[PDB]
Ligand binder design. Structure first.
Ligand SMILES: *[C@@H]1O[C@H](CO)[C@@H](O[C@@H]2O[C@H](CO)[C@@H](O)[C@H](O)[C@H]2NC(C)=O)[C@H](O)[C@H]1NC(C)=O
Ligand SMILES: *[C@@H]1O[C@H](CO)[C@@H](O[C@@H]2O[C@H](CO)[C@@H](O)[C@H](O)[C@H]2NC(C)=O)[C@H](O)[C@H]1NC(C)=O
Ligand SMILES: *[C@@H]1O[C@H](CO)[C@@H](O[C@@H]2O[C@H](CO)[C@@H](O)[C@H](O)[C@H]2NC(C)=O)[C@H](O)[C@H]1NC(C)=O
Ligand SMILES: *[C@@H]1O[C@H](CO)[C@@H](O)[C@H](O)[C@H]1NC(C)=O
Ligand SMILES: *[C@@H]1O[C@H](CO)[C@@H](O)[C@H](O)[C@H]1NC(C)=O
Ligand SMILES: N[C@@H](CCC(=O)O)C(=O)O
Ligand SMILES: N[C@@H](CCC(=O)O)C(=O)O
Lengths: 457, 100, 499, 88
């Protein structure tokens, strides 16, 4: 009936338990409890003693320390007793593994599949290519690559995937053997640090590259990106856990009306009762006991070496900050500025079904929203880019049409090019003496001039 | 043709007969479809006309499940009958028999 | 260190032999506990008591060496099992510190693939339990059959705890050879289900895993079925000897020594010596062992093992051959079959009945409503010849009203049916569309839309229609030589005369 | 050595580019297209049948006996029996 609270914290768990009862009451009429000692010997002995002495319905364990160790033995103890354990605030909940027959662990972490789904949702908005996929030969690397191959079909750009055995020089050379601006790495901390040092020695830690670390965790590269659920409060986490436990117990008592425990103190399959809502976040669970449709956040690194929230994913939808982005690429960055001329350059509304530009076209940003530019100049520009190689952005223009010496000052595309705002201009633009002397010109391809159009004849 | 297809998909019908009837009723401008069926249709309903150079010169086929044991025998029998007069006979009595 | 497992004397002599082969081979073993919690308590107690640098053997009864593996993982110390078969322990996600000296049933599936390749049984049926071991075996069988351009004809999931519906389903397909993988009791249940039907007769050859064969011999054992076993079987003593030998080899190889933990009553910290020795053992290749070149697989399994391919003959198992870690001995003796056949019958069965789908298209497939009695009007051609019509259902959510179809495609089908002995039933596609490949809603994966669903999904068996040859259709399904050449053409209304 | 070019050569080189293999233009002298002379094939069909030539490309029509004796790819240029007459 009651709820047992266990914490492995050596020091903070004391104050947590001191503040416990008020928070537990604040967050069914079932009571609460709190026992903490803070070691498989000690863990097993203390938990068995507590469960023997105290008749409880569900048990919540909260700790954020040495994550990849506690979860298996705790899950085994829960399965042996057949009691609902809930791990919260990282640590045990961070590790996600396939469960057992009678297991009921209710891990509150986030599966790597959800992490990759969120990361790829953030992608296709910043880069179309998941160019570098590097793994450390971790236990989850096989499923990692399988999920990458699953999500890469249909629609993304993609360069290479490799595994690093972690001399640092050999692995650094192997890592640099693949050219890719964006790298996503799957590794643990003890392997994360040497890999970061080797990458720094290999020159890939500059601001040009971005690392999307997705391994289960949490001299340093610039542009680290990761994903987490929430937190960084212990009291709020405890409140959410006890609320979920109480809701599950109330649902169980409504369905059949019997005490939850089944003996299993000295001997001689219920992870299906979770439709849970709390704190404006989804809390339903799957068969394996991991959160379904979670409320996740993506975090990045700042020059102050601190983690700042960048975007939020909820209800299978994303909301980020400063959504506009550009491939800096560092040259190979050319800011193409064009105008609108129906025979040559056609701008059309983006296709809303796919929420993007259709094939045989190029995205174009005005001067926030995106249109699709296509036609003669767009095609010749993309062919030129293919035959040379650079990053081109379709920076359209509004201040003027083609150029005029208004007040001795140029405008239009000529004005944009002259004041270095736009790297180069393509599209409908005729060559004149003043234009040729003010700004250089390439070789003409489509000859034209002054022509007379008359009525029907 | 990707852009042309994106245009065309806003008027694509669901079957041949309705398309032919609509083309009779001038509810549509131009129809694109297989050569044999349209040749027969023009040979029957002498109101429309067939035109254009053939743009996809791939013949028909009798489809079957992958690696089924019948593929060799079905293909060989079809080829033998086609080589024999059976295919031409079945063709003349069933298609190209009308010229208005 | 010590296997839980008279076995104490065996451990003592093994320790003495290993010491004969700075301290070397100290033995610290205990006994099994009735409660797994008590077993874990004993494991942590004697781990705190002595320095354990691991070994554990599966008792005869289903028992679980999981507690010791979980404790070892919690201490990151290397752990090596002896006689555990369940593939769940193979995974390192929850057993990163666990290695095993006996291959699980996944390599049994691999040997099944090898035998099928040897005997040229291209077609295949799987009857697999919904358990984790069965799912892993099925996945390994599918991926081992992936490189060969052939797939499982129909995999059937049998939930643990009658399978007569699945038995009927397997009976009504064209493939006859099946492979079973489930628990012993589930194996007995499905064996009774198959025996009750006529699906255990001649032409129905199948082979199961070790424990399924053992349970069948215990209870039913359908005579003539093949079977597979480990060459050594249980064979605890030789595995103990090879395990202690490889442990001594790894210990000598390590001697950086770091710090083998001891007295870890509350020492909540890993010991890097554990992962270091585990990586060395993974790189290690024990030689001149009792069972041969004892090599550990990347996941922590055995490479190049030995198996006995046995046959059931009236509650008596005869070793037909020996399946090495690479290949199988062809034939040590004579092999029997459940139907008494003296040879290896073809695993397929050419169906005389074919389900043919056909779309309504004007000059090729005429479709008309049936007569008042449901028959077809006996019309004649201009040349005074009958039209060999056929009767087929399918046309109008609305119910499947039978109707009379006749045309060029129908005539060709008649001629083919005369050429090769067929019995055929026609039915038009409910969707009434030529069936391209389309990306399904709310998912990245795509599927064969329309009438092609009638062929890929097994609804039909031969698509007879004005089908045009193109790329992805040739990719998924197979075609024949074309019977009518044609292109794509423009139809436009035009008025010729001028008044 | 001679230089071979045209339709079949171009399609063969495009196929090689899109697949990747080393192809040698082993021409033939014993026969033209194939005949069951003394129950023995000759020509390009004879060369392919006895494993002397890995595969045959170029002018070669598909018939029942040829199809059953040796496998065939998908036809691309349709053809058959035709009648050519004098000036008209
Ligand atoms: C494909 O055609 C061949 C040729 O007739 C068939 O092979 C014959 O099969 C029958 C029955 O098994 C035998 O009696 C003949 O001796 C076989 N002849 C030859 C030349 O092989 C074959 O069975 C057919 N296969 C299918 C699936 O229809
Ligand atoms: C080496 O072997 C000896 C003999 O078995 C072990 O000594 C016993 O160890 C157990 C468990 O620690 C104690 O309960 C006994 O009291 C010990 N008896 C004696 C006579 O020493 C010793 O612990 C082993 N050492 C290691 C490191 O495994
Ligand atoms: C049989 O009935 C189905 C169901 O109404 C018909 O299919 C529909 O056709 C209309 C007309 O184009 C479409 O708007 C619907 O979307 C179709 N529905 C489905 C489920 O396909 C079909 O045309 C009918 N066929 C005959 C021969 O009567
Ligand atoms: C299988 O079991 C079901 C449910 O008990 C029963 O309806 C059916 O008749 C059984 N079939 C056979 C062949 O025993
Ligand atoms: C096919 O049918 C014919 C006619 O009845 C018969 O002579 C022949 O033996 C049959 N062949 C097979 C394989 O059934
Ligand atoms: N094409 C002209 C602009 C429009 C016009 O004058 O025709 C130019 O580049 O100056
Ligand atoms: N093209 C023919 C050879 C020449 C002919 O008979 O027209 C064939 O492949 O058999």
């Amino acid at each position: 009936l009651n709820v047992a609270l266990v914490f492995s914290g050596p020091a903070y768990a004391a104050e947590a338990a001191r503040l416990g009862p008020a928070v537990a009451a604040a967050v069914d009429v079932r009571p609460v409890a709190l026992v903490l000692n803070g070691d498989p010997r000690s863990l097993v002995l203390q938990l068995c003693d507590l469960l023997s002495g105290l008749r409880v319905h569900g048990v919540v364990f909260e700790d954020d320390s040495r994550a990849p160790a506690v979860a298996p033995i705790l899950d085994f103890l829960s399965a042996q007793t057949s009691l609902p354990i809930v791990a919260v605030h990282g640590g045990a909940a961070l590790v996600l593994t396939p469960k057992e027959k009678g297991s009921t662990f209710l891990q509150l972490g986030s599966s790597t599949e959800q992490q990759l789904q969120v990361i790829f949702e953030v992608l296709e908005e910043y880069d179309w290519t998941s160019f570098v996929a590097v793994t450390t030969r971790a236990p989850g690397h096989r499923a990692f690559l399988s999920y990458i191959e699953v999500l890469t079909d249909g629609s993304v750009g993609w360069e290479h995937r490799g595994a690093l055995t972690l001399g640092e020089a050999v692995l650094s050379a192997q890592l640099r053997s693949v050219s890719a601006q964006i790298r996503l790495l799957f590794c643990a901390r003890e392997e994360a640090e040497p890999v970061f040092r080797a990458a720094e020695e290999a020159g890939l830690t500059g601001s040009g590259y971005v690392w999307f670390m997705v391994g289960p965790q949490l001299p340093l590269p610039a542009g680290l990106f990761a994903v987490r659920s929430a937190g960084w409060d212990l009291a709020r986490r405890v409140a959410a856990g006890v609320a979920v436990v109480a809701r599950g117990a109330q649902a169980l008592l409504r369905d059949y009306g019997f005490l939850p425990e089944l003996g299993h103190d000295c001997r001689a399959s219920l992870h299906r009762y979770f439709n849970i809502t709390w704190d404006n976040r989804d809390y339903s669970f799957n068969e394996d006991g991991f959160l379904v449709n979670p409320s996740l956040v993506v975090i990045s690194l700042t020059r102050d070496r601190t983690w700042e929230v960048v975007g939020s994913w909820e209800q299978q939808t994303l909301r980020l900050k400063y959504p506009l982005w550009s491939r800096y690429g560092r040259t190979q960055h050319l800011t193409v500025a064009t105008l609108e001329e129906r025979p040559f350059v056609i701008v059309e509304p983006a296709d809303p079904i796919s929420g993007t530009c259709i094939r045989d076209s190029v995205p174009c940003r005005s001067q926030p929203e995106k249109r699709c530019c296509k036609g003669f100049c767009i095609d010749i520009l993309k062919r030129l880019a293919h035959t040379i190689g650079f990053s081109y952005d379709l920076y359209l223009v509004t201040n003027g049409k083609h150029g005029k010496k208004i007040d001795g000052v140029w405008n239009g595309m000529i004005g944009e090019v002259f004041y270095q705002r736009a790297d180069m201009a393509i599209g409908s633009l005729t060559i004149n003496e003043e234009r040729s002397e003010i700004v250089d010109f390439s070789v003409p391809f489509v000859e034209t001039g002054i022509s007379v159009m008359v009525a029907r004849s | 043709l990707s852009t042309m297809y994106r245009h065309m998909e806003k008027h694509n019908y669901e079957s041949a007969a309705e398309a032919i009837q609509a083309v009779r009723d001038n509810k549509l401008h131009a129809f694109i479809w297989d050569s044999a069926v349209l040749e027969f249709e023009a040979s029957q309903k002498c109101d429309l006309v067939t035109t254009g150079e053939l743009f996809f010169r791939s013949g028909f086929g009798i489809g079957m499940r992958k690696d089924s044991p019948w593929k060799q025998n079905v293909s060989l029998s079809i080829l033998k009958s086609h080589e024999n007069g059976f295919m031409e006979d079945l063709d003349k009595t069933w298609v190209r028999y009308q010229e208005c | 260190i010590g296997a839980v497992l008279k076995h104490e004397q065996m451990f003592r002599e093994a320790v003495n032999q290993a010491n004969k082969r700075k301290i070397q081979l100290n033995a610290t073993s205990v006994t099994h506990k009735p409660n797994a919690i008590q077993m874990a308590l004993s494991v942590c107690e004697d781990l705190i008591s002595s320095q354990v640098y691991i070994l554990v053997s599966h008792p005869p009864t289903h028992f679980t060496p999981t507690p010791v593996s979980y404790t070892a993982g919690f201490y990151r110390i290397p752990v090596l099992g002896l006689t555990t078969r369940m593939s769940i322990y193979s995974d390192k996600s929850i057993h990163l510190s666990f290695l095993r000296t006996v291959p699980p049933y996944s390599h049994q599936s691999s040997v099944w693939f090898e035998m099928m390749r040897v005997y040229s049984w291209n077609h295949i049926i799987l009857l697999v339990s919904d358990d984790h071991e069965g799912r892993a075996a099925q996945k390994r069988l599918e991926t081992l059959l992936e490189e060969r351009e052939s797939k499982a004809e129909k995999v059937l999931q049998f939930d643990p705890g009658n399978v007569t519906a699945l038995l009927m389903e397997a009976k009504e397909l064209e493939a006859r050879v099946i492979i079973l993988s489930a628990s012993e009791d589930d194996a007995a249940t499905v064996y009774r289900a198959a025996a009750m039907l006529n699906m255990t007769g001649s032409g129905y050859v199948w082979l199961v895993g070790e424990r399924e064969i053992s349970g069948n011999a215990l209870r039913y054992a359908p005579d003539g079925i093949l079977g597979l076993q480990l060459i050594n079987g249980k064979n605890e003593s030789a595995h103990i000897s090879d395990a202690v030998g490889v442990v001594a080899q790894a210990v000598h190889e390590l001697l950086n020594i770091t710090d083998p933990p001891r007295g870890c009553v509350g020492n909540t910290n890993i010991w890097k010596t554990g992962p270091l020795f585990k990586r060395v053992l993974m790189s290690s290749k024990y030689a001149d062992g009792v069972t041969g070149r004892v090599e550990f697989n990347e996941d922590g399994d055995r490479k190049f093992a030995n198996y006995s391919i046995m046959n059931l003959q009236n509650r008596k198992l005869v070793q037909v051959g020996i399946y090495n870690g690479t290949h199988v001995i062809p034939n040590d003796r004579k092999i029997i079959w459940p139907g008494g056949e003296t040879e290896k019958p073809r695993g397929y069965q050419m169906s005389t009945r074919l389900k043919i789908v056909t779309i309504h298209q004007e000059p090729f497939v005429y479709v008309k409503p049936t007569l008042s009695d449901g028959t077809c009007k006996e019309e004649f051609t201009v040349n005074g010849d009958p039209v060999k019509k056929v009767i087929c259902t399918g046309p109008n959510p609305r119910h499947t009203v039978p109707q009379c179809c006749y045309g060029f495609c129908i005539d060709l089908l008649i001629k083919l049916a005369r050429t090769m002995n067929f019995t055929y039933e026609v039915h038009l596609v409910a969707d009434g569309k030529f069936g391209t490949q389309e990306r399904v809603n709310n998912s990245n994966k795509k599927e064969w839309n329309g009438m092609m669903g009638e062929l890929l999904s097994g609804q039909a068996d031969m698509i007879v229609a004005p089908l045009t040859i193109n790329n992805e259709r040739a990719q998924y399904i197979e075609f024949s030589k074309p019977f009518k050449y044609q292109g794509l053409t423009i139809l436009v209304k035009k008025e010729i005369p001028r008044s």
